[PDB]
Amino acid sequence: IDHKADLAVAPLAITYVREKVIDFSKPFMTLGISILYRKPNGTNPGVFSF
Amino acid sequence: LIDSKGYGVGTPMGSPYRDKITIAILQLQEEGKLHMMKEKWWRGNGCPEEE
Amino acid sequence: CGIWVRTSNGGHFASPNYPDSYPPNKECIYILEAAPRQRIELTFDERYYIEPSFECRFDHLEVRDGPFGFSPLIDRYCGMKSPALIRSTGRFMWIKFSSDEELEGLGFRAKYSFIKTHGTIIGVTSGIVLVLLIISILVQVKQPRKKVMACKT
Numbered sequence: 271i272d273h274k275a276d277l278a279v280a281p282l283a284i285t286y287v288r289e290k291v292i293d294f295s296k297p298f299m300t301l302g303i304s305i306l307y308r309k310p311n312g313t314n315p316g317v318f319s320f
Numbered sequence: 321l322i323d324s325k326g327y328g329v330g331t332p333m334g335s336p337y338r339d340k341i342t343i344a345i346l347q348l349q350e351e352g353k354l355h356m357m358k359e360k361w362w363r364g365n366g367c368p369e370e371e
Numbered sequence: 372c373g374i375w376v377r378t379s380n381g382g383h384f385a386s387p388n389y390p391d392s393y394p395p396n397k398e399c400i401y402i403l404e405a406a407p408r409q410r411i412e413l414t415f416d417e418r419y420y421i422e423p424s425f426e427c428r429f430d431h432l433e434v435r436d437g438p439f440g441f442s443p444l445i446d447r448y449c450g451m452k453s454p455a456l457i458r459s460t461g462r463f464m465w466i467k468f469s470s471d472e473e474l475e476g477l478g479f480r481a482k483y484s485f486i487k488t489h490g491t492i493i494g495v496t497s498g499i500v501l502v503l504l505i506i507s508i509l510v511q512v513k514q515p516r517k518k519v520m521a522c523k524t
């Protein structure tokens with residue numbers, strides 16, 4: 271804002287509100303949000319499935 | 321995926337730098353340095369495959 | 372309509388029908404690809420010396436600094452002016468020629484300068500498969516020996 275630095279080269283959301291106050295370059299990478307969760311315990315050991 | 325946002329580069333307001341770094345960004349994209357560069361910091365260790 | 376002028380240190384680009392009127396309703400994208408470290412020198416050859424007092428629509432020639440219709444806009448030219456020469460090191464010029472539904476012109480002239488086999492074999496340790504097959508084949512070979520010996524006896 272105050273010119274006190276130059277272009278902030280950093281991962282930053284190109285958001286609506288900052289847009290009025292800062293200009294933003296054509297994006298270099300996209301974004302998304304995904305769910306994160308564990309793995310299943312595992313297969314049935316398959317030793318004696320009988 | 322759920323949503324999609326944007327990583328670009330911030331800049332002083334109305335500065336000519338932004339519009340001439342945009343072309344550089346686009347050039348890097350339409351070259352492909354972006355993808356391999358992305359991998360080079362995101363490669364890590366490959367998980368063994370699952371059925 | 373388009374012309375690939377790639378990998379030319381120089382070559383010639385112009386409106387289709389250059390000497391005659393350029394065609395109507397034409398939308399042809401013209402592409403300038405310069406290898407990295409190259410500086411792009413466009414040379415534009417004007418056909419008519421007079422100054423238009425009006426910059427109007429219907430007929431425009433676009434210049435882009437990177438992929439067309441997509442990259443930052445350099446300029447939109449019209450009239451009978453030759454535009455001034457364009458020097459960019461963006462390495463990519465992406466140009467379109469337009470046309471309206473009437474009222475064509477002298478056209479324009481430009482120059483660019485650059486400076487079951489697998490099924491059996493593929494298995495978890497087919498080696499196991501082969502060992503089992505070996506055991507089976509060998510014992511099947513054992514059988515008719517005792518068959519013939521029993522027949523003899």
Ligand SMILES: *[C@@H]1O[C@H](CO)[C@@H](O[C@@H]2O[C@H](CO)[C@@H](O[C@@H]3O[C@H](CO)[C@@H](O)[C@H](O)[C@@H]3O)[C@H](O)[C@H]2NC(C)=O)[C@H](O)[C@H]1NC(C)=O
Nearest residue numbers: 421422423424425426427428447448449450451452453454
């Ligand atoms: C002597 O006076 C004439 C008439 O004023 C000057 O010609 C120029 O005429 C146009 C008429 O529309 C004036 O408007 C301008 O047109 C240009 C080109 O389309 C446009 O870019 C401007 O924004 C504006 O609309 C123009 O002002 C005028 N030019 C001037 C006064 O310099 C002629 O140039 C004058 N010659 C001298 C030696 O001053």
Ligand SMILES: *[C@@H]1O[C@H](CO)[C@@H](O)[C@H](O)[C@H]1NC(C)=O
Nearest residue numbers: 306307308309310311312313
């Ligand atoms: C197995 O499932 C249980 C769930 O209660 C939990 O211990 C964990 O999420 C899984 N993994 C291991 C190693 O226990």
